[PDB]
Amino acid sequence: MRECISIHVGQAGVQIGNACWELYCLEHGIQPDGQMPSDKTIGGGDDSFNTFFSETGAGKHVPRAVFVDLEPTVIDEVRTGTYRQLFHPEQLITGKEDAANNYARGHYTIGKEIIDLVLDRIRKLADQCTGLQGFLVFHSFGGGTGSGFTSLLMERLSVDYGKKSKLEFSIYPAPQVSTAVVEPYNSILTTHTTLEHSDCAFMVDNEAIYDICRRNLDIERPTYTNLNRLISQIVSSITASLRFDGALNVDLTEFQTNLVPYPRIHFPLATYAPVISAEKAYHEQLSVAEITNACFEPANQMVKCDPRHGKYMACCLLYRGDVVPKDVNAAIATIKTKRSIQFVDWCPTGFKVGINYQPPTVVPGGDLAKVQRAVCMLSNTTAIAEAWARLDHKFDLMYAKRAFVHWYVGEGMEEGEFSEAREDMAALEKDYEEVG
Amino acid sequence: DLGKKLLEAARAGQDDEVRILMANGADVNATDASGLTPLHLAATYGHLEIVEVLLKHGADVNAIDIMGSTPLHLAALIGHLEIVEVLLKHGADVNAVDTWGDTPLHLAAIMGHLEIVEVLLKHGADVNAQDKFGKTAFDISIDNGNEDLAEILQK
Amino acid sequence: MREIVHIQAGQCGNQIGAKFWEVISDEHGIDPTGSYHGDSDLQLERINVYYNEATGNKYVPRAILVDLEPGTMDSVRSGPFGQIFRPDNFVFGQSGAGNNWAKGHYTEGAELVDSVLDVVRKESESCDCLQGFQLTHSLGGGTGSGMGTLLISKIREEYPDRIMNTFSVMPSPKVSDTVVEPYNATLSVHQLVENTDETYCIDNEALYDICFRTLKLTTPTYGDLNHLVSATMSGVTTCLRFPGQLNADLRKLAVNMVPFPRLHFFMPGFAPLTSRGSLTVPELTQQMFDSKNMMAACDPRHGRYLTVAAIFRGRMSMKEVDEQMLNVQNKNSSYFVEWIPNNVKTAVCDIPPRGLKMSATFIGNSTAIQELFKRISEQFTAMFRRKAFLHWYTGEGMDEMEFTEAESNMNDLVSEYQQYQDATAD
Ligand SMILES: Nc1nc2c(ncn2[C@@H]2O[C@H](COP(=O)(O)OP(=O)(O)OP(=O)(O)O)[C@@H](O)[C@H]2O)c(=O)[nH]1
Ligand SMILES: Nc1nc2c(ncn2[C@@H]2O[C@H](COP(=O)(O)OP(=O)(O)OP(=O)(O)O)[C@@H](O)[C@H]2O)c(=O)[nH]1
Ligand SMILES: COc1ccc(/N=N\c2cc(OC)c(OC)c(OC)c2)cc1O
Ligand SMILES: [Ca+2]
Ligand SMILES: [Mg+2]
Ligand SMILES: [Mg+2]
């Protein structure tokens, strides 16, 4: 057993973190006060769930998690909510004044006032670990804190924890539920400064999640509560291999080995199926072939892009529930007889499969129906370059006129940092073109 | 030199002092360094009684300063309606043009003195007179969206 | 980001300032003595943004009242909410400024400025996390214009990292035919381009035109004009005073609305327009973007929107608002710059203003605002070319070059708006 520490930064990171930890508790049988009756070893243990939860002498199972925000309103909802007794009170860190949607305030001026306290509190959790493997960092690209403070934090974690893995869950901006006009700037600046310091990053496109809520869940106008519940189900499916027994993606290093062929092209695409409305409680149960085929439909993707226009470098299928391995083999064999799936000529043309035989858990109050079998596909495809091109184009439209740049330069940032970040994104776009 | 004292009395509105200075031979048409006369100053600072008395004592109603301003241009710019009427009754040239190509109509229109615009139009102000940039008083009203002024200039 | 310190200077500044406090006190359930008589918790959630909590559960405005004329203090005190203000927060001089900007900025105004700054310091030290300042004033007089801009620069020196916002009333000969007002306004605009982060332009020309042509009031009074100003000020401060989906503050407004530092002059708008004593979502979105509903006498269809913030108040479908706002942007696509993506932001607040079930407030950063600056510039130049009444200013120590510098800076501002009006994406 090797421990994982989760860090939730800014509003989006904190709200998604709250939804994830609620779901983890329901999956593991942990009550809101931290008690876990099924855990026979009181005060300690080496079980797979201990990768995410420590244990106290009184039988309390505490998340190995830190929540940080530069203003207190969002974290105050965690401090007074249903799971207020679950977290380490010193694990919930707040400043008084936020980054005002400005990367430079998050990174250089406001962020510097709390960075040392956050690192000292992370060290307290790290000191409790026997074999820390690394960190899971949750944050928006668009927010000033999610963009700027996260980049500063990832820079410091690389110096203080050199050999440890760092994985991100990043929220990619959408016009439908955006906060700021400058989100494309914050997104490019954080991507450039974090690229070296992150080993693998799962982007979540808010437009993709918004469309899934509208089309599959019949939610006319999805709110963050609806988006976050669906995101938490996908994040749970991705982290399940670290918290339960299994043979695929059992540690953070294996995520890199399986999904990241080269350091810079470290952005896998997630696809999840089936997503069925809770109002359809008597829905027909979909077979392994049906849910597997649905992974290759662009409508079920976590990022809007078309994998038919790209090439695959890796593909992992993670099943949960009543899934017979021979049915997976037969469904994959059918999938290989389809012109739309092309692998690069230098990777083995194969699929890695993991099965957890417990079906997914649904949260009370959620929008999803219970299902007997579900799948999350993680792939590294060159089609994800389409998401970077869309973001780079919005950056270029404003940057050509230097619109809003004075706000960043006024908060300790050099104008040349914008050109350096954009040049790195042009190189990243060419890295995908050179693979295919 | 009583001309310099008459210029100060006309600006300050000292009615009795104007009468004493003229009775002692002060030059009613004295000029300051920029070519302004006692009548220009009384019309700028709104001293109606001084304007009337200077006109009964040989003041040139159409005197121009170094920039071509007549007393009517200054009364129309500052918005002294009663002074505009007295100057017009005493022969002021309604279409006098200064070094910027402005007429009294242009200045009354720019400053929004609509009652003075009406009086000038009734006394034959030329709606086609162009300033040095080609603008008439109607062009000024259209360019600044002053519908009240555009309505008066179309009557 | 919570507390705002409000300052009101001069006659106009104190008149519109007092009406602002009357209108927002009624929305938050605060009575003239400072007691809360409301029936909703959403009224008290962000009350500390504008009010201090005194002993006895009394809410006192965080407001400083300034004037060189003592008489203004009497009119404020005699008003309905005149006793709610802190008596120590009234800072008044002996003799006014006589509509002379130089007296407000360099002589009478400079003598009283340290007293005002003492009161500003005491209100600021009493804040948990001060966001910045809000000033109400006219630009055509002497105190609000001359002393108001001096106060802005001094507050800017002591609090350089806080936001400075103004509600600045622009002069018009339709409301006050006083020919030195274009001088006072141009001298003030030179100061506001450098020393404020965001300025709401409230134009007396537009207020008169709405009252006369749209509301059919044959002889508009200051009370009629101030009814539109108070409705606008309530609307634009909605997201600072109520929770909503956004945690809005003055800095997030500036970062998202001001792409170039000097272009921080907003054109506010309001729908429905109503007179004292006397709609569907598609009607409100349409009226909100109409020239007849703007509080600056500019036609938005003569320029382009750089950024827009809209606030809808009342009970309505947020899906309907999203669709109608998307529709107005598609049909009016040539009036938005194409190089600032997603430059229109909408907020919906459940609490409507008094006497209305539904309302909409618009805040536009439009290049068409150059029409307002051009109108003032032409009047300033007509007067300045003849050096009319210049001795009234130079006699107070002002240099003639300050007039030339103010004129040149305002003509440069107009050129900067034209530059972005003509720019293309390519
Ligand atoms: N999916 C999802 N997106 C969110 C959530 N909250 C905010 N966002 C997105 O995150 C971006 C805004 O960043 P935030 O995380 O709110 O900002 P922040 O990190 O708190 O930074 P500052 O407030 O600027 O200091 C926008 O693209 C929002 O749509 C959430 O709970 N879920
Ligand atoms: N909308 C509106 N404009 C007003 C009001 N009071 C004055 N004004 C305008 O403000 C300008 C005159 O400035 P005032 O505020 O009266 O002057 P002040 O700031 O007190 O300065 P001094 O009197 O010169 O010391 C003119 O353009 C007036 O039309 C008011 O209540 N509402
Ligand atoms: C143009 O886009 C934006 C504009 C402002 C933004 N931030 N904060 C505010 C938003 C407001 O209304 C929507 C507002 O109401 C007036 C407000 O008052 C304080 C602040 C965010 C944006 O993406
Ligand atoms: Ca145990
Ligand atoms: Mg935030
Ligand atoms: Mg006054």
In this structure, the answer to whether residues A181 and A293 fall within a common structural domain is no
CA of C224 to the centre of ligand 2 (A): 15
In this structure, the answer to whether residues A345 and A429 fall within a common structural domain is no
In this structure, the answer to whether residues A107 and A140 fall within a common structural domain is yes
**What is the H or E stretch that residue C284 is in?**
helix C281-288
**Which pair of structure tokens corresponds to residue B63?**
């005197």
Distance CA C168, CA C191 (A): 12
Let me know how long chain B is.
155
Distance CA A429, CA A395 (A): 14
Tell if the CB–CB gap between C319 and A220 is shorter than 8 Å: yes
Are A169 and A17 contacting, i.e. CB atoms less than 8 angstroms apart? no
For C320-416, list the strands marked E by DSSP.
344-349, 358-366
Considering only CA atoms, which of A176, A162, A83, A82 is closest in space to residue A126? A162
Considering only CA atoms, which of A383, A397, A395 is closest in space to residue A420? A395
Are C172 and C43 contacting, i.e. CB atoms less than 8 angstroms apart? no
Tell if the CB–CB gap between C251 and A406 is shorter than 8 Å: no
Helix extents (H) in A138-223: 144, 150-160, 183-194, 206-215
**What is the H or E stretch that residue A381 is in?**
strand A373-381
Considering only CA atoms, which of A270, A345, A350, A336 is closest in space to residue A305? A270
Letter string b/e over residues B109-128, b meaning 16 or more CB atoms within 10 A of that residue's CB: bbbbbbebbbbbbebebeee
Compute the nearest-CA separation of C117 from chain A (Å): 24
Question: How many CB atoms neighbour CB A241 within 10 A?
Answer: 21
Query: For C259, which of A96, A180, A404 is closest by C-beta distance?
Result: A404
Question: How many CB atoms neighbour CB A429 within 10 A?
Answer: 15
Of A383, A408, A424, the position where a domain reaches its end is A383
- Tell me which ligand sits closest to the C-alpha of residue A100: 1
Are A303 and A202 contacting, i.e. CB atoms less than 8 angstroms apart? no
Instruction: For residue A318, give the CATH number of its domain.
Output: 3.30.1330.20
In this structure, the answer to whether residues A143 and A188 fall within a common structural domain is yes
Cα atoms found within 13 Å of the Cα of residue A164, Cβ hemisphere only: 22
In this structure, the answer to whether residues A302 and A160 fall within a common structural domain is no
Neighbouring-strand partners of residue C61:
C51
CA of A229 to the centre of ligand 5 (A): 20
What is the arrangement of strands in the sheet containing C344-349, beginning at the earlier edge strand? C90-92, C63-67, C4-9, C132-138, C163-170, C198-203, C265-271, C358-366, C305-314, C344-349
In this structure, the answer to whether residues A379 and A403 fall within a common structural domain is no
Are C282 and C312 contacting, i.e. CB atoms less than 8 angstroms apart? no
Tell if the CB–CB gap between C179 and B69 is shorter than 8 Å: no
Name the residues of A annotated as catalytic.
254
Distance CA A315, CA A343 (A): 10
Mutate: best of C292, C386, C390, C392, partner B, most B CBs <10 A:
C386
Query: For C256, which of A96, A180, A221 is closest by C-beta distance?
Result: A180
In this structure, the answer to whether residues A233 and A367 fall within a common structural domain is no
Residue B74 contacts C where some CB pair is shorter than 8 Å: yes
Tokens 């360019």 sit at which residue? Answer: B143
In this structure, the answer to whether residues A160 and A308 fall within a common structural domain is no
Residues 6 or more apart whose CB falls under 8 angstroms from that of C120 comprise: C5, C7, C64, C155
Tokens 């930890």 sit at which residue? Answer: A21
CA distances for C54 relative to C42, C126, C240, angstroms:
20, 12, 21
CA distances for A418 relative to A143, A158, A194, C259, angstroms:
17, 23, 14, 16
Q: What are the backbone dihedrals phi and psi of residue A275, each rounded to the nearest 5 degrees, phi first?
A: -115, 110
Are C193 and C258 contacting, i.e. CB atoms less than 8 angstroms apart? no
Are A286 and A321 contacting, i.e. CB atoms less than 8 angstroms apart? no
CA of A403 to the centre of ligand 3 (A): 17
Considering only CA atoms, which of A76, A81, A30 is closest in space to residue A52? A30
Considering only CA atoms, which of B145, A137, B97 is closest in space to residue C209? B145
DSSP A30-65: --TTSB-TT--SSS----GGGGTEEE-TTSBEEE-E
Closest C-alpha to ligand 3, atom 18:
C239
Domain that holds residue A426: 384-436
User: Are chains B and A touching, using the cut-off of 8 Å on CB pairs and a minimum of 3 such pairs?
Assistant: no
Q: Give the three-state DSSP class for B90.
A: coil
- Tell me which ligand sits closest to the C-alpha of residue A144: 1
**What dihedral angle (degrees, nearest 10) is formed by the CA atoms of B69, B71, B75, B77?**
0
**Which pair of structure tokens corresponds to residue A60?**
């309390």
Pocket test for ligand 3, best of C253, C308, C336 (most atoms within 8 A of CB): C253
Question: How many CB atoms neighbour CB C280 within 10 A?
Answer: 11
Residues 6 or more apart whose CB falls under 8 angstroms from that of A137 comprise: A6, A7, A9, A13, A150, A153, A154, A166, A167, A168, A169, A198
Considering only CA atoms, which of C363, C306, C309 is closest in space to residue C338? C306
Are A121 and A152 contacting, i.e. CB atoms less than 8 angstroms apart? no
Tell if the CB–CB gap between A181 and C247 is shorter than 8 Å: no
Helix extents (H) in A280-340: 288-294, 325-336
DSSP A94-111: E-SS--TT-HHIIIIISG
C81: DSSP letter: T
Count the domains in chain A.
3
C214: DSSP letter: I
Domains and CATH numbers, chain C: 2-259 (3.40.50.1440), 260-368 (3.30.1330.20), 369-426 (1.10.287.600)
CA of A223 to the centre of ligand 1 (A): 12
Compute the nearest-CA separation of C368 from chain A (Å): 18
Are A214 and A220 contacting, i.e. CB atoms less than 8 angstroms apart? yes
Tell if the CB–CB gap between C378 and B144 is shorter than 8 Å: yes
**Which pair of structure tokens corresponds to residue B74?**
């200054």
Task: Give A 52-81 residues with CB within 8 A of chain C.
Answer: 71, 73
Please give the residue of chain C at the shortest CA–CA distance from B108.
Answer: C382
Of A233, A268, A303, the position where a domain reaches its end is A268
Instruction: For residue A414, give the CATH number of its domain.
Output: 1.10.287.600
In this structure, the answer to whether residues A160 and A71 fall within a common structural domain is yes
Please give the residue of chain B at the shortest CA–CA distance from C291.
Answer: B145
Residue B107 contacts C where some CB pair is shorter than 8 Å: yes
Distance CA C184, CA C20 (A): 24
Distance CA A102, CA A143 (A): 7
Specify the pairing of strand A165-172 against strand A134-140. parallel
Letter string b/e over residues C156-193, b meaning 16 or more CB atoms within 10 A of that residue's CB: beebeebbbbbbbbbbbbbbbeebbbbbbbbbbbbbbb
Elucidated via: X-ray
Specify the pairing of strand C4-9 against strand C132-138. parallel
Are A226 and A179 contacting, i.e. CB atoms less than 8 angstroms apart? no
Considering only CA atoms, which of A182, A184, A397, A393 is closest in space to residue C337? A397
Of A383, A398, A419, the position where a domain reaches its end is A383
Domains and CATH numbers, chain B: 1-155 (1.25.40.20)
In this structure, the answer to whether residues A372 and A399 fall within a common structural domain is no
Please give the residue of chain A at the shortest CA–CA distance from C128.
Answer: A96
CA distances for C367 relative to A160, C267, C419, angstroms:
50, 10, 9
Closest C-alpha to ligand 1, atom 12:
A143
Closest C-alpha to ligand 2, atom 28:
C176
In this structure, the answer to whether residues A52 and A157 fall within a common structural domain is yes
**Which pair of structure tokens corresponds to residue A435?**
């693979």
- Tell me which ligand sits closest to the C-alpha of residue A182: 3
Please give the residue of chain B at the shortest CA–CA distance from C181.
Answer: B111
Compute the nearest-CA separation of C364 from chain B (Å): 20
Distance CA C398, CA A332 (A): 85
Distance CA C86, CA C158 (A): 23
In this structure, the answer to whether residues A222 and A364 fall within a common structural domain is no
CA of C6 to the centre of ligand 6 (A): 19
Pocket test for ligand 3, best of A98, A140, A176, A181 (most atoms within 8 A of CB): A181
Distance CA C43, CA C99 (A): 39
For C245-393, list the strands marked E by DSSP.
265-271, 305-314, 344-349, 358-366
Q: CA torsion sign, A234 to A154 to A100 to C343?
A: negative
| Residue C238 Cα: closest atom of ligand 3 | 15
